[PDB]
């Protein structure tokens, strides 16, 4: 007999998805906010936001409320909070409800107290945080019960996140700030050097997700992108290659396959030999890039799986551990 | 519930449009008024007026109510609006009305707000101040709304505006003194160097129209003009061709070429990539000079549309706009 | 309701000219008055005083009552206002009627003022002054209202006038002592030095109207000519040919191209072109110089029109003119 709502949450640097329980997941959309530096009011957010990176009168303040797990813009995040919400023909789902937080292994107690503070400000009742990595297995379709040992790639926009798990716990985990972002950047960056257009963003992200990889593929193509020219100013178009991107994603991973390296080298000796035979597992957004299964295989000769529906593997594990959490709560805990 | 009148206004330096909801489009004529200098008399605006430009008595003083969005004239202004609804069968409908005007980029608050002071002196409860550029945007058939960029060039007769607009913003605006008014001086500083001929502006004005152009048109022609022979001071008549004319508009939209050129300069990257997509749009009475959208595309390489109807495109904008202004009415801004 | 008569006046230097209202031209002879000087009678005024020219007592006084537009005596002025409308069998016309004057552009605010004098002094009530050049223009047929430029060159026996008029206004203004009087005395210099004959005036009248003209015509013809020998004193006779007269009268308008060369030096740009279009109209006694029209399209190379019945111009603008004064009157001007 639970009368109280579930919300669970997956509060990504990039993408912003809401659970409800008995109406599935309820929102997805970016993480990007738009404020009135003039007045501060919320202009817009999720994908109206979105679509107005880089296109902005100079009034408008581009947010991100949540930076790799850290509630980076308070108000903007109780601003997201009392949206998410907003499309349901329901009063508040907040009151008294059971809230599921997920946390990178980087995030501080400190800040995991912030997290819960917001919940319960909205009017949540029970509070929980578990570790992204464990919900991103979960969601991938591991048993993590079991005593098994799997290593976990979490690569999402602003951290790239690994793991070890086993017996349903993190038994070695190692973070870096090289993500989505940092490979956005680094595209941007190299348009720049090689061909002296300044590009957006926005224009980064969509070459790395129309042409970008790790490995040859069977459908190499160009792309053609518009910026402006670092000399004359004015607008210039240009053409991008698939092994140009490609090698710019290599120089990007080159310091998570050191991570990984380091993780490896931290990790008991017989969790070594199930990682051999069980493999990685790749999660989050950055498993999209094409042939990164190859790319670690090729590497660490590795069996290497992408998750099915990478993006939503933590939300998809949330929904999971909902029977745990409310088998606790009758268990008192 | 609406019960005020809705009156818009195109308040150009050259030409002057009117609209009522209800009406349509009740006034567009010459801004050009004629003052009886010893008696200060309205003796004639509108067309009755510019029919005399050149031809009028001594004691006739011709008055330009409004520069450049600029009131000029407080009492040839007041003058103007006791008179656009004067040919409308019904009691004044300023009062209490809802007044929508269009600015320019360059008008400064304060004019502004001198606008609005002539407006409510007339007797309207509401008076709204628009952006001319995303006003002839609109008129031009854009939707502004979206989160795409567009290049919008307005030649009137004071002014050149440049808009970058997106998402119903103007996120970078130039605007330039060479207009209508300065091709028809350089028309005429021409004739003048190169025939020794003073001729009077209406007289460059018209040349500008009859085969004014930017580049050769499928149908170049010859025009006669007839001035004063700067020598013997005598009516003296001479033989205009395209080429020459093209010649001066060219030389005359050097400095408007320039200040496209510091827009783009100052556009975000990422605006640049829709601004080589979407192209330019030109609107306003210069829209009309032949081939200026080859002009556009020669000089810059970027698509160039000329608006439909280039001359109503800001009070075809204000039209559009309406249905906005009385749902925010509805909201209490 | 007008119950008040309206009444006209061309009280030219040579021919005067009057219109009632309801019974049309009543009087239309020279402006010749004789008077005795022994006894101050006015002996004849008109026709009859015309037929004595050079041919009268030494006690008879040859008066001209206005000349140049200006009472030269007050006395005859009021003289043949008491007598044009003497023929009329109708008590007094000039009771509380409405008089409308015409006077040259030269005439004097002083003597303008005047000449409103002795109309009121008559019975007038309202007395109107309009500008001769606006009448004539009317006289001719052209719709002065438009803004369209037209050249006036009035020649009468006092004055040669020219305006440059539009918009119903007078524009540029110019005006000579050298018309149909200089004519006479040029050509009577002419003969004595030619032939060593005096003439006297109205022999030379008769000349230039007999075969007078400026350019050679379809009918050369010469003249039998009667006057005294400056030698013997005695009566001689003389045969004067076209080509003799012709070459007087282009001599004495010498001076009148120099007249219309200063106006057009002086007249708009704009308003130059016009002229270039519409042309000169010649109206006046002077219009009747044979080819007339011939010699100014030579000399300037515009179209030159005279006008149909060329004596009458004015009064007949008087006539097209009495709508507008009632119109006036009924407004309270
Ligand atoms: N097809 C694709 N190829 C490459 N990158 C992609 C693709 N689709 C999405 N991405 C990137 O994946 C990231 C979004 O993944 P996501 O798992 O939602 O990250 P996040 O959880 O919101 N941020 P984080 O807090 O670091 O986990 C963005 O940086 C996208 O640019
Ligand atoms: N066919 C044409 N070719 C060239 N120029 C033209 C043509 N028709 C009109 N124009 C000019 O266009 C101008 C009028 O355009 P318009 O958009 O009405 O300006 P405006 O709004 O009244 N003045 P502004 O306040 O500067 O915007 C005048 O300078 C005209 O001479
Ligand atoms: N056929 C003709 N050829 C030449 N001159 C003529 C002819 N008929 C009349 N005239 C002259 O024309 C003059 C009369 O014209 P008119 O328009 O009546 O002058 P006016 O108005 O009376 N004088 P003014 O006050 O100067 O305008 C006289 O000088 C005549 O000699
Ligand atoms: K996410
Ligand atoms: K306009
Ligand atoms: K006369
Ligand atoms: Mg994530
Ligand atoms: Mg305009
Ligand atoms: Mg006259």
């Given at each position: ?198 590009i957006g963003?926005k224009t980064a992200?969509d ?18 992108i ?108």
């Amino acid at each position: 007999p639970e009368t109280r709502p579930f919300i669970s949450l997956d509060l990504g640097t990039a993408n912003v998805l809401a659970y409800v329980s008995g109406q599935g997941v309820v929102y997805n959309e970016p993480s990007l906010m738009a404020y009135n530096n003039k007045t501060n009011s919320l202009i817009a957010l999720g994908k109206a936001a979105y679509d107005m990176v880089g296109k902005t009168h100079g009034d408008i303040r581009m947010v991100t409320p949540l930076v790799d797990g850290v509630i980076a813009d308070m108000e903007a995040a109780q601003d997201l909070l009392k949206h998410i919400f907003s499309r349901m023909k329901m009063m508040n789902i907040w009151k008294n409800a059971i809230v599921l937080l997920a946390c990178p292994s980087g995030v501080t107690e400190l800040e995991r107290e912030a997290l819960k503070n917001v919940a319960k400000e909205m009017g949540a009742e029970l509070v929980i945080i578990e570790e992204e990595a464990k919900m991103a297995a979960l969601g991938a379709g591991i048993n993590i019960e079991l005593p098994q040992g799997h290593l976990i790639i979490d690569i999402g926009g602003g951290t790239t996140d690994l793991a070890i798990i086993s017996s349903g716990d993190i038994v070695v985990s190692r973070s870096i700030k090289v993500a989505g972002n940092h490979f956005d950047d680094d595209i941007r960056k190299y348009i720049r050097s090689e061909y002296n257009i300044a590009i957006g963003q926005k224009t980064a992200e969509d070459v790395k997700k129309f042409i970008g990889s790790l490995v040859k593929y069977h459908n190499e193509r160009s792309m053609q992108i518009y910026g402006r020219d670092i000399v004359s100013g004015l607008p210039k178009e240009a053409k991008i290659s698939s092994e140009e991107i490609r090698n710019v994603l290599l120089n990007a991973f080159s310091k998570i396959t050191d991570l990984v390296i380091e993780l490896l080298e931290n990790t008991p000796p017989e969790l070594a030999g199930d990682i051999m035979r069980n493999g990685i597992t790749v999660c989050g957004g950055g498993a999209l890039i094409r042939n990164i299964d190859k790319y670690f295989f090729d590497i660490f000769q590795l069996p290497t799986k992408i998750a099915s529906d990478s993006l939503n593997c933590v939300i998809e594990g949330t929904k999971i551990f909902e029977k745990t959490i409310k088998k606790n709560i009758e268990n008192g805990l």
